[model samples]
Target chain A: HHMRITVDRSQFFKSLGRVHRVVERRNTVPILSNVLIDAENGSVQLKATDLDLEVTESFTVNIEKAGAITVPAYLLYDIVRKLPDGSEIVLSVDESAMSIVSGCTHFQLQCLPKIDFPESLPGQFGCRFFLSASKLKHLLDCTQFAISTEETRYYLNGIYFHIVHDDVLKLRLVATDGHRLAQVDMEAPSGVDGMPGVIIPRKAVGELQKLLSEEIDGDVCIELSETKIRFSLGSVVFTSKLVDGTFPDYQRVIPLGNDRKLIVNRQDFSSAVDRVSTISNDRGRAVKLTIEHGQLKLVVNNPDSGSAEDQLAATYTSEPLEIGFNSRYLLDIAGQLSSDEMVFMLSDAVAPALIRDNNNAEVLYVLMPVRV
Target chain B: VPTLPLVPXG
Candidate 1:
């Protein structure tokens, strides 16, 4: 059980921080809290997993002795992060613990045998495709906010990735909590035809998003199977289990008959919603929207916190309409719009309202009305 | 009756 490695503190700490987040905060197994470190062939590989998700990264390091060990992920990260910038940290493993030596600093941390670390699920990916890092980021950014946090309905706890063949083949990303739904699509990358739709669990979507933001430079390689999915960015590989539940028929929920349309500036509408919501009750944050021929008015009436009313000039040609909705939900949907104006299509007070960016068919949002 | 194992906090 002898291995010694020297690594730059700054570079090593940054990579360790990314891998450490995949480890569960509370674990029933001891090894699950540890990260497996394998140093050989002039490279050091760090791996962490929480059963359903795993992140593994490899980097070049000066390896004097080659072996493997498992150490507490957070403790190692904390130690390396505290080391002064540009300092080189040397780590050694003995029979009992891991020893760290930095500039005028020494520490020893307990280690768990690497053999006890749980093995990641092994499977062959059936579908593989290449997607640009920017495209991957856009798909997740627009839909992840709508993923349900409720654990009871496990199906809605992730973003559904699928391919749709309309006039042109497109890749679709959708998420909803039964209150609001976000659906975004882009041209399906090549080689992704006939790929089965998979629900990427919320935690994996989050970790992959963070990783892409930092590490992605060119196209990322994606490999998918029935029960698991993997993403490859250069040397790093990310893997996660697919949620084993059927995603509901989301297309049916999108309204196709709503005719009443109101066009308003996105910045104006979002800020109005934010201001009016301040007076609404913290529980529901409900706001009432009144739309007429040439103006839109927002009202918030809270018995405990008084009331607020704001109005903005807009164009609505259909009959007058009033609807109730969660202000936070409205703001969340509005925040996704990149265009100058937002288009709202309404059928009635009780029906789900549809929202879209002006002339942008790539994204759509449906929000269920609430009783104010 | 079977007893549940104590969960580790850290």
Candidate 2:
């Protein structure tokens, strides 16, 4: 079978560039590292998957003959990337090989049959709608910092995404590491019924962050089954397997019976905590926050080095309270805030402190305090 | 469950 087609450099670059990232650098199965190029009706599709995650790219090409083949994804990505940014890249299939040609360049890559490409079966999706890219990115950034690296709790390794009926029905993302928690939601899309939470794995979340980071504005089409989730944006289609473990009852983890409220200018408090945390040592990396009416002090003591302390103005009416938190955790939470001021609800030094912005209360962070 | 978490060194 002679398969021939010509794809332009810029379009092909973005197509290969966007799709091949789903292929893991190290794959046990040989074909898993390959990108399937399916050519039909003057339109070519490039798709790749790592069993769990799949991404597809469809674009128009100058077609002479229609055929399909698979080539090493990253290798083809590398070849296209190195070519001059101007001109067309021609592709043709041979016996267990692929011919790559452009001006003054020819590459014969040992390719494979497209049949071997692992394609996930098209199962029925319970819900399908469009999700705003900005909202999705906000959800990711808000909860991504709290993903658990602890392998024992395999279920905690991804964000729990589900729809809930509160604040006018919303789609929420929840992440927790047993030590800290992040919950953020956006107004839900239509077809909200018959949808439950799905634990999307960390790799999928990271890939989404990458896709969303590159100026992906507006809404992307979303379709979800209980075990799989798919996103479509322009010519790029992304699908991933959901983690088959249960996320904890996170609602209970968020402490609501908190009396004291501490309000501070977000940047001022962040810089103050950062300044005082300079002397913190490796294991004992806690910053004690001593807050009183109109004043807040951040103190960090390291036995190996000197101690540091800084004060920032705050609005705290309750009696003086000292709470300790991992310095980096507070900084991470603060970094995600969009509001100028952040508020912390507290019960005591031991209870998990709920933190949110003054402007948007939809996003909340619950951080367990460490004993300094 | 007071599992005191710490930030990894930058």
Candidate 3:
């Protein structure tokens, strides 16, 4: 028997674009590059997975006959996207070939057996909770920039999520790349107790960020198990395998007794760092900071690329000091600050510097210095 | 080269 469905051109392509990112270009298994289309009742589900992660997006379609089909994801997306807008596209698939027909165009692409498509299994969940999409997106924005890209230290390649015990329980998200670290604390939702700290892989974090960004204000349900985690975003469900390795103890890296303080406008500090970094070398874009009474000077001197300097008014009461840090790290940390004023606590050039907003105590950034 | 996973691509 053949499977048939009629879908609006615009609506179908939009859903296809959401799930297409889960299909990897390199297919170790031939069917890994294909998307599974399951049509039933009144809706069609388009799903794709790369073994490590899976995404399923569904939309309304007129099902002539309820059945399933597997086809190359990118090819199908390309064909439907080019079809005339507002036109109804009819798709028929059988054991031999898959046909696409619209106003004046017809395309027949080879079809693979639906039975070969891999299934994503959601094992028994240990805990489940709910959070707003906007709140989750904010958490990712604050910490994902600091996630390490080095594959060798597989543990640091993702954000570490765990509950921290304070006067009130707070869900904390932390990420580090050995040079810098970002930590954000938020109110813990119910059912998060006894949940082991899990390291979410970088790819899964990216997918979740994308989804949350789209649906900004709805409640998102999260289910977690020992090895697998699931996120429910209204019409879509995303599943990913957790990184099996353990994250390092990052709490030890945060500075505790740094007393010397420097307060400056976040926007001004970011602009100064950006200007000086242009003159720094591409590989090690270190910027030198000379802090003195009521003033901070940022200097960049690269033997191969010229030099640049910028100064800004700051509030400082400690003795003059000099420090060197990767300009890129400074800019990234500053970008996450929500308040206009940012405070920096420094013990000396050798110790890590701590940055936080004067009003918000829920977030902090720690950066290591480079020897000039 | 892939921009993500390596360059911390957005």
Candidate 4:
């Protein structure tokens, strides 16, 4: 029977959380888990799923009518999620059809049956828990930019959420465009100990980010297993399938024991680094740094263009060495600094260089040198 | 053939 149902604040928020920003709603498939609504037992279940991901949430309803319907998942999710908070919402259902009445407006929603909705992702996920939502958000926020976008190397294109040691769960995100690679790491929720790493696909990272912001609370519980990850935030829950592939051995790429080290005022060094490399020609812009005794020298030359050199004071006590690296790469690493001083660690002319702010120890950046 | 204008990440 078609009827009007009144939904409360918590109930409406709960339902809206179920369908937000899911990519499956944009699929060409007619019934690949479009929004499914089942009204019975004094409650309603609102859900939507792409084949790879599914979200199910239930809401308490004041039923003046009892029935079920399915609508274009994304559209309905958008409407409810964007609605003004705490507003009483009236939903009228008629023969598997839905009309949402909020404030002074009414939206007609096309409906499909709940059985036509695809099966919810089975819960074989061995690891599940309610975690510190803010802590999980902090992990995602700090390293999300490094998630790769390369299509062919699928494994590198996701968040490697895993345990770094038996007791410390770490989330590492990495990205590279062949020449420049970036990685960032952050501590995960405490409950993730001994859990294997899972790569959160790029799309899910995006939608999950939205879910995080919409959350009434700051933190979200991150649940994961061999092939799946779920983040339960506030009234909404996000589930994503893991990218099934071996992540590159990034440990091998991080540089170590690059003995020639120079500590200098960060602003002064970065200014000199940026100003000197400005005149290089487009092809393979190379900047050479020569460190000796108590001084640091920055040099850049593009064969067809004129060369430039600048010097900055440094606390260096190593044998003199000249190393060439991409000017842009050095600039990027230097720009990330906030402290007054930074350390430039180098092993050899052809080795990778590590740059980090002198004051902070949480984040470190490494860049490979380019041969001139 | 739909193009979504880049949404601000912040």
Model 3 spans > 4 angstroms off: B1-10
Model 3 residue A303 CA deviation in Å: 1.2
lDDT of 4 by residue, A171-257 (tens): 555544333445556665555556786778877887776666664565566678888888776556677889998665555556767
* Model 1 chain A lowest lDDT segment of ten: A114-123
Q: Model 3, residue A282: displacement in angstroms?
A: 3.3
Q: What are the iRMS values of all candidates?
A: 19.3, 8.7, 10.5, 15.2
RMSD (CA, angstroms), candidate 1: 6.7
The better-scoring model by DockQ among 2 and 4 is 2
lDDT per residue as tens, model 1, A315-368: 899999888888998999998888999999998887778998988878899888
TM-score computed on alpha carbons, candidate 1: 0.94
TM-score of the candidate numbered 3? 0.94
Model 2, span A96-188: residue lDDT tens: 898999998999999889888887667578888887888778789888889988888778889999888886788899988878789987788
True contacts kept of 3: 0.00
DockQ of 2: 0.15
- The model with the greater lDDT, 1 or 3, is 1
What lDDT is reached at residue A275 by model 1? Answer: 91
Better of 2 and 3 by TM-score: 3
TM-score of each candidate? 0.94, 0.92, 0.94, 0.71
**Rank order by TM-score, top first?**
1, 3, 2, 4
